[PDB]
Amino acid sequence: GKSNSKLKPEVVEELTRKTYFTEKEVQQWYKGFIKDCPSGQLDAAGFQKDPTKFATFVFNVFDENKDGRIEFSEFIQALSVTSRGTLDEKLRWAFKLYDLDNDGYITRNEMLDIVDAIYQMPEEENTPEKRVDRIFAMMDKNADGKLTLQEFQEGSKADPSIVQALSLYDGL
Ligand SMILES: [Ca+2]
Ligand SMILES: [Ca+2]
Ligand SMILES: [Ca+2]
Ligand code: NA
């Protein structure tokens, strides 16, 4: 008598209120989620399914409570921010992605780890090192080798390409 094939009504209401989705959209996302992960808990191996490193970094941000599983509430809220969030919401989310040790700063090495993963997944951009050097030249204002949330927000907003990439809604 499986009890998690659909959401409880109160949870449909909760999740609709916490995201940019309609009730119908929340239920549609659950249908697909539970089909692909009947346990209701998506683990790192499942999320994975060369992209290994970057999928693992994204997995950790989806995993809000850090218990090694992405449950639906986590899945749908991450989808909400990354697909439909405002520019500032998406920037806060991206900062969490890059801040690997959750200390409130993105170091050069933290960023390098992410950018390498993206690459693993034009001469002046042909290494992760070059890409990071450029980002830090543009965003690190006190030259201490790390980005505060403010440095990352303001730095990102200065660059038209970054603004474009974070200003989409359902990919458009
Ligand atoms: Ca979790
Ligand atoms: Ca950090
Ligand atoms: Ca700095
Ligand atoms: Na600009």
Q: Which ligand is nearest to the CA of 99?
A: 2
Q: Which ligand is nearest to the CA of 143?
A: 3
Check whether residue 33 and residue 92 sit in a common domain.
no
d(CA 89, CA 166): 9
Domain that includes residue 53, residue range: 11-86
d(CA 52, CA 50): 5
> Residue 165 is which amino acid?
A
What backbone torsions phi and psi does residue 168 show, to the nearest 5 degrees? -90, 155
Check whether residue 171 and residue 94 sit in a common domain.
yes
Distance 158 CA to ligand 4 centre (A): 4
Determine the 3-state secondary structure of 79 from DSSP. helix
Check whether residue 41 and residue 23 sit in a common domain.
yes
Structural resolution in Å:
2.0
| Element containing residue 164 per DSSP (H, E) | helix 160-166
**Residue 92 assigned as binding residue:** no
Q: Count how many domains the chain has.
A: 2
**Residue 89 assigned as binding residue:** no
| Method for this entry | X-ray
Check whether residue 159 and residue 94 sit in a common domain.
yes
